[PDB]
Write a protein that binds this DNA or RNA. Structure first.
Ligand SMILES: [Mg+2]
Ligand SMILES: [Mg+2]
Ligand SMILES: [Mg+2]
Ligand SMILES: [Mg+2]
Ligand SMILES: [Mg+2]
Ligand SMILES: [Mg+2]
Ligand SMILES: [Mg+2]
Ligand SMILES: [Mg+2]
Ligand SMILES: [Mg+2]
Ligand SMILES: [Mg+2]
Ligand SMILES: [Mg+2]
Ligand SMILES: [Mg+2]
Ligand SMILES: [Mg+2]
Ligand SMILES: [Mg+2]
Ligand SMILES: [Mg+2]
Ligand SMILES: [Mg+2]
Ligand SMILES: [Mg+2]
Ligand SMILES: [Mg+2]
Ligand SMILES: [Mg+2]
Ligand SMILES: [Mg+2]
Ligand SMILES: [Mg+2]
Ligand SMILES: [Mg+2]
Ligand SMILES: [Mg+2]
Ligand SMILES: [Mg+2]
Ligand SMILES: [Mg+2]
Ligand SMILES: [Mg+2]
Ligand SMILES: [Mg+2]
Ligand SMILES: [Mg+2]
Ligand SMILES: [Mg+2]
Ligand SMILES: [Mg+2]
Ligand SMILES: [Mg+2]
Ligand SMILES: [Mg+2]
Ligand SMILES: [Mg+2]
Ligand SMILES: [Mg+2]
Ligand SMILES: [Mg+2]
Ligand SMILES: [Mg+2]
Ligand SMILES: [Mg+2]
Ligand SMILES: [Mg+2]
Ligand SMILES: [Mg+2]
Ligand SMILES: [Mg+2]
Ligand SMILES: [Mg+2]
Ligand SMILES: [Mg+2]
Ligand SMILES: [Mg+2]
Ligand SMILES: [Mg+2]
Ligand SMILES: [Mg+2]
Ligand SMILES: [Mg+2]
Ligand SMILES: [Mg+2]
Ligand SMILES: [Mg+2]
Ligand SMILES: [Mg+2]
Ligand SMILES: [Mg+2]
Ligand SMILES: [Mg+2]
Ligand SMILES: [Mg+2]
Ligand SMILES: [Mg+2]
Ligand SMILES: [Mg+2]
Ligand SMILES: [Mg+2]
Ligand SMILES: [Mg+2]
Ligand SMILES: [Mg+2]
Ligand SMILES: [Mg+2]
Ligand SMILES: [Mg+2]
Ligand SMILES: [Mg+2]
Ligand SMILES: [Mg+2]
Ligand SMILES: [Mg+2]
Lengths: 185, 222, 51, 156, 53, 148
RNA sequence: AAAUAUGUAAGAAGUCCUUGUUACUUAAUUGAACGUGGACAUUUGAAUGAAGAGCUUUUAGUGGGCCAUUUUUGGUAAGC
RNA sequence: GGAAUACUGCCAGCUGGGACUGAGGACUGCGACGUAAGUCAAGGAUGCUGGCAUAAUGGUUAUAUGCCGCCCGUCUUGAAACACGGACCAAGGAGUCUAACGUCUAUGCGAGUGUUUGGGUGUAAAACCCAUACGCGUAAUGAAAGUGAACGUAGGUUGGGGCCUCGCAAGAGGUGCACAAUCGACCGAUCCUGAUGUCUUCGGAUGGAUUUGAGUAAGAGCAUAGCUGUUGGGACCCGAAAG
RNA sequence: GAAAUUGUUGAAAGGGAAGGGCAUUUGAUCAGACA
């Protein structure tokens, strides 16, 4: 026998293809596993994995969040890459040129970009243009903005939001939430 | 397009070149080793002549075999048997001796047999049952390029170069020695020499520092 | 595919380690040591044979 | 269909053999096997027959003969590991034997040449045997283990 | 140890190196020759049982 | 579908994956929200602080509607002008002709001030305003016209 | 006053220099805290090991335990 | 005085007998031997010879013989138990459906989203189409009247993939999304401060505070579907004494 | 026209249960490959 020192037959814990069942996605993955096995550019390696990501680990990036990244010092001519959908944001009033390479572009997001004469590019098109990801800015969206993560870690003195359905006065605002009704949290 | 034999040439010749370096190197250690020995032999005699007593330097290096199986071990020695990479019965690993490992040894005397291994037995441990750790895996030695590939960084480009780093506890003993996968010995062939293993050597058992009698044992297990 | 042990397969013995050829050529493994005869101090003996 | 077809078939191309490294080097015989030596046949048609050894053939067999006119055994092939080699020896320097090889025993009753050869060799031997007395008798009588005899202990 | 270590680092570096400033564990003893002049070994035996009382 | 369900897999084991010792029995905790203040109080303080007792005033016959008053931040506002008509006004931003926006008509009740509207003038018709809302609007040279 | 157990430390989140900020603090541009600028790289600061490390969500069963060496309480004692 | 031997250790000294194994399937590697051509035991067995070509080897089965083997199911610290159910066999026989839900995931669309109450239409309970609303989301906080989210490049610091620049490389610098840590700013509540003014008691600017919120700080949601989990229901199946 | 369970016929085993595991003898039985 062997005094094992670590659990035996353990799966690595990382996805290895997507869980998704879309041909096109499965082709894009066919593409990038090639580029990652054969170019040693780090970029391709990052993208291959982001393709496996599930819908939550793929929050949407907004065209305004995009506009801001180009606002970075030295970055205005880079092509932003988004391994996810890109969405619209009527809150910005002035969107730049550039070239966004994503998986999906919503109707309005695509318009906004193009209306300022920019380009919307699919990843494979991005690949042919930049097989080492030359001159690319990868953007991810805000993961812990999800409504769900509000209720993670609920406990005393954590400040976290009840899993609650109806929600007004007289829904969980009494004994335990104020000094004058037993105690507070 | 050359490379027919063209780069076979600038390769085979280059390969010849290394054997050359290995050849003169192995010739050197052999000098090293016997004159080192002889020197001691004359130390001892010279002192006797002088009416003095030559006490040797205490051993810098030991060889530990795990002797106990895997069940009913208390936690503190159990950790140590892991840290010394002895996690299976009869496996063995080399240990460089200092206060800070000597105490480790103390903790596990009931579970091991160790002693001072000779050149002979370090040599045949490595030639026969010696394996490297390469992206884990555990790779038979059997060619010198396997070593130079990994240990070469530190000098050390041959199997005898390995051995030499071990036995002399070299400047790079830690990497040299960690590179070697724990040896996996069989049970002794002659037997254990005793009716009950789990008392100290000094009481007619098998465990603990049994000093230079370690070689007789290991050789029967290798 | 099949580990061969140098300690009994001359071929690979000589693959690793080219010194092996001359080691054996020059006997070496039976090297005759320099014959000197220092004698030990009476001190040393006296106390060896003491009670 | 009763069964879906597989999506993949094996190829029916056979491979070639890896180039094996196994030189067929000659068999050196145990030192007790020099020609002229009497042999005991441990197995076979002529099992327990005491027989003269004549020539190591190229297929490693031993060439022996009775002589036929002594004990009935002809010029023959015998395997070296089914034979006890005794210590008693006749001189065989008068016996030609050059003729006899593997093809000479290729199957392809008895051919007059065989019947002739046997007489030419055996005459040379008999000439020799007769020198030491009782050999011919020794040669003409079967070996067998008698109660008590312990082979791992007997000198032959 | 640090203020000392920065010291002998300058005292080294700006001389021509031979740094060497990590701590090492108690090392085993080197060879040595013990003498007898004025010191011949005294031979001791074990001692009989006795009762003091 | 029954097909993919874990009971299909539990067939053949004795206890249906509910345990030999502690069984699966009718209602060990009691039913429902029972024991809230006793054997289930640890789970209710944490996870549900604030559950028991009362706070403010009762309101008999409250009519949601009375309080209907959706909010729109300056954040948007320009959204309430149709796309094509919009760019028309952003350029050529002026008094004499500035867009009227009836936020009531767009179904909002109060304008709040979340952030930055270009220096185009707007005429903003609302029921209520954030003090900032009005301020910011004015800083672009528009105003707010109170309606109903 | 042991032995066994037990807290902390063994560096880049480190050491040193020059001198900004304040409503705290000083008799005091004194201190305190947070800084800008500069100098020293892996023998950069013990050992051994590391089939890597960190992190998040959600859910089962369980919530009768018994035994051995050693320490040990009650009991004359116990397969207590 | 000068040897021998024992004992322990070494040899990349030589050599015999016996057992198991023969994975791999062109070549490719590291070598060895030779003046060389070649050769080889050097990244896993080949050569030579015989017998049978069929129940001979092999499978199955019955029996015999060596050794071994208590009755399952259950609850239990502990069962083969002098614990319980079970004489036998067939057939039936137990975690379901629904309302509303958590986490996770797949898919549509995305600051939105949801055609199916209804209308239109039909090859008629389908498929196809759709106006107005509504629901959840896009704002919070307060018991409430109520008020309601940019000092700043939507901030500073520190880690940070990736990318950009230099360099042959090692490296150095530039930028740094997600995420984490920390200090701040904004909105409401609480408390303090109370300007310009006033139907002289209204108004509440402004600047603050070991207080406080399920908040802001370039949106992530809505919907369908699945496994697991949650509550109500006969609620996995059979069972009281009773009312 | 299953099974429990039964009759007959054939074959086999049986010194206080039977049934089972590894292995082989013996009997019965049979696939395949060869050309
Ligand atoms: Mg929100
Ligand atoms: Mg070690
Ligand atoms: Mg032996
Ligand atoms: Mg034996
Ligand atoms: Mg023996
Ligand atoms: Mg015994
Ligand atoms: Mg062995
Ligand atoms: Mg060959
Ligand atoms: Mg031979
Ligand atoms: Mg006769
Ligand atoms: Mg269901
Ligand atoms: Mg189904
Ligand atoms: Mg199934
Ligand atoms: Mg299961
Ligand atoms: Mg299972
Ligand atoms: Mg099952
Ligand atoms: Mg189970
Ligand atoms: Mg379960
Ligand atoms: Mg049960
Ligand atoms: Mg209530
Ligand atoms: Mg908004
Ligand atoms: Mg400690
Ligand atoms: Mg290590
Ligand atoms: Mg690792
Ligand atoms: Mg749990
Ligand atoms: Mg639990
Ligand atoms: Mg529980
Ligand atoms: Mg219980
Ligand atoms: Mg025990
Ligand atoms: Mg083969
Ligand atoms: Mg094969
Ligand atoms: Mg047949
Ligand atoms: Mg036959
Ligand atoms: Mg039968
Ligand atoms: Mg049977
Ligand atoms: Mg038995
Ligand atoms: Mg039970
Ligand atoms: Mg009981
Ligand atoms: Mg009993
Ligand atoms: Mg019962
Ligand atoms: Mg019964
Ligand atoms: Mg049934
Ligand atoms: Mg139709
Ligand atoms: Mg109809
Ligand atoms: Mg239509
Ligand atoms: Mg209508
Ligand atoms: Mg008011
Ligand atoms: Mg309100
Ligand atoms: Mg700061
Ligand atoms: Mg950097
Ligand atoms: Mg920076
Ligand atoms: Mg505030
Ligand atoms: Mg409050
Ligand atoms: Mg809320
Ligand atoms: Mg909400
Ligand atoms: Mg339920
Ligand atoms: Mg009932
Ligand atoms: Mg009833
Ligand atoms: Mg009744
Ligand atoms: Mg009643
Ligand atoms: Mg009928
Ligand atoms: Mg059988």
């Amino acid at each position: 026998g062997i005094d094992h020192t670590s659990k035996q037959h353990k799966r690595s814990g990382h996805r290895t293809a997507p869980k998704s069942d879309n041909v096109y996605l499965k082709l894009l993955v066919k593409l990038y596993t090639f580029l990652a096995r054969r170019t040693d550019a780090p970029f391709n390696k990052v993208v291959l994995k982001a393709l496996f990501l599930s819908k939550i680990n793929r929050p949407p990036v907004s065209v305004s969040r995009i506009a801001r990244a180009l606002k970075q010092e030295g970055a205005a001519n880079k092509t932003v890459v988004v391994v996810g959908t890109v969405t619209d944001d009527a809150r910005i009033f002035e969107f730049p040129k550039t070239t966004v390479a994503a998986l999906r572009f919503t109707a309005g997001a695509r318009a906004k970009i193009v209306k300022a004469g920019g380009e919307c590019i699919t990843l494979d098109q991005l690949a042919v243009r930049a097989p080492k990801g030359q001159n690319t800015l990868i953007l991810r969206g805000p993961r812990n903005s999800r409504e769900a993560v509000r209720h993670f870690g609920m406990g005393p003195h954590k400040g976290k939001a009840p899993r609650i359905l109806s929600t007004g006065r007289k829904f969980e605002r009494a004994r335990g939430r104020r000094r004058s009704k037993g105690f507070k949290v | 397009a050359e490379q027919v034999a063209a780069e076979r040439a600038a390769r085979k010749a280059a390969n010849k070149e290394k054997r050359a370096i290995i050849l003169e190197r192995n010739a050197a250690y052999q000098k090293e080793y016997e004159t080192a020995e002889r020197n001691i032999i004359q130390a001892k005699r010279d002192a006797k002549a002088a009416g003095s007593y030559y006490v040797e330097a205490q051993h810098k290096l030991v060889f530990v075999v795990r002797i106990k199986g895997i069940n009913k071990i208390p936690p503190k020695p159990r950790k140590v048997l892991q840290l010394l990479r002895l996690t299976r019965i009869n496996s063995g690993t080399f240990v460089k001796v200092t206060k800070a490992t000597l105490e480790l040894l103390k903790l596990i005397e009931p579970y091991v047999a160790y002693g001072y291994p000779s050149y002979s037995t370090i040599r045949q441990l490595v030639y026969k049952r010696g394996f490297g750790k390469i992206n884990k895996q555990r790779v038979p030695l059997s060619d010198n390029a396997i070593i130079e590939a990994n240990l070469g960084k530190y000098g050390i480009l041959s199997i005898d170069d390995l051995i030499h780093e071990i036995i002399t506890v070299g400047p790079h003993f830690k990497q040299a020695n960690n590179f070697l996968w724990p040896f996996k010995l069989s049970n002794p062939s002659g037997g254990w020499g005793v009716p009950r293993k789990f008392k100290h050597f000094i009481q007619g058992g098998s465990f603990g520092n049994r000093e230079e009698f370690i070689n007789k044992l290991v050789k029967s297990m290798n | 595919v099949l580990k061969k042990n140098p300690l009994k397969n001359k071929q690979v013995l000589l693959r690793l380690n080219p010194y092996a050829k001359v080691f054996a050529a020059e006997k070496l493994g039976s090297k005759k040591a320099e014959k000197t005869g220092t004698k030990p101090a009476a001190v040393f003996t006296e106390t060896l044979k003491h009670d | 269909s009763a069964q879906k077809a597989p999506k993949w078939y094996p190829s029916e191309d056979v491979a070639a053999l890896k180039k094996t490294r196994k030189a067929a080097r000659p068999q050196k015989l145990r030192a007790s096997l020099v020609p002229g030596t009497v042999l005991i046949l441990l197995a076979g048609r002529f099992r327990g027959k005491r027989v003269v050894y004549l020539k190591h053939l190229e297929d490693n067999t031993l060439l022996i003969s009775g002589p036929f006119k002594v004990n009935g055994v002809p010029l023959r092939r015998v395997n070296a590991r089914y034979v006890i080699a005794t210590s008693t020896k006749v001189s065989v320097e008068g016996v030609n034997v050059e003729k006899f090889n593997v093809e000479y025993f290729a199957k392809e009753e008895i051919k007059a040449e065989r019947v002739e050869d046997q007489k030419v060799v055996d005459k040379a031997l008999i000439a020799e045997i007769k020198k030491t007395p009782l050999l011919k008798q020794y040669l003409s009588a079967s070996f067998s283990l008698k109660n008590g005899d312990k082979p791992h202990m007997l000198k032959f | 140890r640090v203020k000392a270590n920065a010291a002998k680092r300058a005292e080294a570096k700006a001389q021509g190196v031979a740094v060497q400033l990590k701590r090492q564990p108690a090392q085993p003893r080197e060879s040595r020759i013990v003498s007898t002049e004025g010191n011949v070994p005294q031979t001791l035996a074990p001692v009989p049982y006795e009762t003091f009382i | 579908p029954s097909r993919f369900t874990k009971t299909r897999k539990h067939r053949g084991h004795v206890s249906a994956g509910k345990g030999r010792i502690g069984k699966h029995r009718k209602h060990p905790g009691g039913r429902g929200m029972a024991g809230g203040q006793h054997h289930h109080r640890i789970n209710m303080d944490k996870y549900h602080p604030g559950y028991f007792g009362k706070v403010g005033m009762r309101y008999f016959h409250k009519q949601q509607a009375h309080f209907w008053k959706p909010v729109l931040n300056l954040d948007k506002l320009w959204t309430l002008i149709p796309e094509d008509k919009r760019d028309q006004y952003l350029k050529s931003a002026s008094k004499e002709t500035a867009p009227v926006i009836d936020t009531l008509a767009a179904g909002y009740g109060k304008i709040l001030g979340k952030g930055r509207i270009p220096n185009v003038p707007v005429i903003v018709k609302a029921r209520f305003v954030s003090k900032l809302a009005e301020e910011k609007i004015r800083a672009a040279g528009g105003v707010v016209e109170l309606i109903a």
